[PDB]
Design a protein around this ligand. Structure first.
Ligand SMILES: O=C(O)CCCC[C@@H]1SC[C@@H]2NC(=O)N[C@@H]21
Ligand SMILES: O=C(O)CCCC[C@@H]1SC[C@@H]2NC(=O)N[C@@H]21
Ligand SMILES: O=C(O)CCCC[C@@H]1SC[C@@H]2NC(=O)N[C@@H]21
Ligand SMILES: O=C(O)CCCC[C@@H]1SC[C@@H]2NC(=O)N[C@@H]21
Lengths: 120, 120, 120, 120
């Protein structure tokens, strides 16, 4: 209900997610940036029984950057929380890992942050 | 074949995963540490068509820290790569996000690293 | 000139810095949040000869959370870049490490992000 | 006494540091890897009054990747803890930020981990 829907980051990337009663996140991620083109499968987990003291709902998901058209040989994971209300928000930090040789493995993992809203 | 199996981190946590032909990771995570007890659902993605130049296979997965017995109101995401061979390895960095109030949201996200092997 | 001055994060924390000709950052950090009170020493480094292609100036600094009044037994490091102009900005990610036992060392390091401006 | 000395990471990089009575870290970093050559200035902070319950000493430092010979237009920060004894150790996580355009700013920050020992 809260987490199910279409979400938009600050850089124009679309996250279309379903929050299953079990705790499953399934969907598609469309990335406006990077070595990516078009639509990618998303899987993840959320807290299906969150705290009743105004705290956010912990969640996370993974996109492997491989569809029928492109393969970036990389995966992003987002770790975050859903903050429900009028101005509904998913505040995340992410890790992007690239497939490297053991000599390049030190420089394999980019870190960042994304804020997602339900407003295009 | 490579990624499918039972994996062990440096702190004694068990990761039992199946790597589906589509790019799906499904399994269970048993955590030896933290505010956790017993067995938790794992979902993730991997690069189902990796590079043929000695590079690792990018992957990622999520555990929401909620089963039938416990709820820690938190989720970990691991971002990493599978390095195949005799001494097969998953080198990861992780983000653990806790469900917080907006006043506590600065301190919501722990970062770390795990190395997983197929040797108990 | 650019980096020298008083800076304000999104959570109301004051960063007063001098950018030395050698590449030295020296100053004080006043933290509006956490287990902190009042004014703490800052040391860091910046790129004293940045690129002339509209790119930001790489920098970083450390605060150990210990003055004459408090000791939180912790240190934050910020890694970022100075973006000069009319709306001058320091975009950072940070690591906060706490002094722990080896059993608690997995949960020692919080990660986040701060944006600093010259507007109070 | 504990933190003052020559330190070696897992990838063969030398950290030569002095731990001042005030809490100041000063030194040189010699990087065995990356777009770097030779010797770079290090500044940082440590907890000069740590806890007497077997807990590590929180510290941090910054290297801007610029000397008289090279400029990588980047800075690394390490956040960590000193674990004293027979097998003395500095366990860190790091952020490497590169000077980028605002279009490339999402991919500006690499994350990793280093363990330093006093054994070459
Ligand atoms: O460049 C790549 O290796 C593949 C595309 C990565 C897209 C990045 S992942 C973090 C951030 N979130 C997005 O909306 N896309 C970028
Ligand atoms: O303490 C909690 O909030 C829930 C348990 C967290 C387990 C952590 S997640 C990162 C690391 N990997 C493990 O094997 N377990 C710990
Ligand atoms: O709570 C502590 O352990 C000490 C105070 C930490 C202050 C944090 S560090 C990251 C963020 N930046 C700030 O302005 N202060 C908080
Ligand atoms: O490649 C660059 O941009 C400059 C050199 C970076 C060296 C990296 S920083 C993290 C790690 N620690 C080291 O010993 N060196 C590498």
């Amino acid at each position: 209900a809260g987490i199910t829907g279409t979400w938009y980051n600050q850089l124009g990337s679309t996250f279309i997610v379903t929050a299953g009663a079990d705790g499953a996140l399934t969907g598609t991620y469309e990335s406006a940036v990077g070595n990516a083109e078009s639509r990618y499968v998303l899987t993840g987990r959320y807290d299906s029984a969150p705290a009743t003291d105004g705290s956010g709902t912990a969640l996370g998901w993974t996109v492997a950057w491989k569809n029928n058209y492109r393969n970036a040989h990389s995966a992003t994971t987002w770790s975050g929380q859903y903050v429900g209300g009028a101005e509904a928000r998913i505040n995340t930090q992410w890790l992007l890992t690239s497939g490297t040789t053991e000599a390049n493995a030190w420089k394999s993992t980019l870190v960042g942050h994304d804020t997602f809203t339900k407003v295009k």
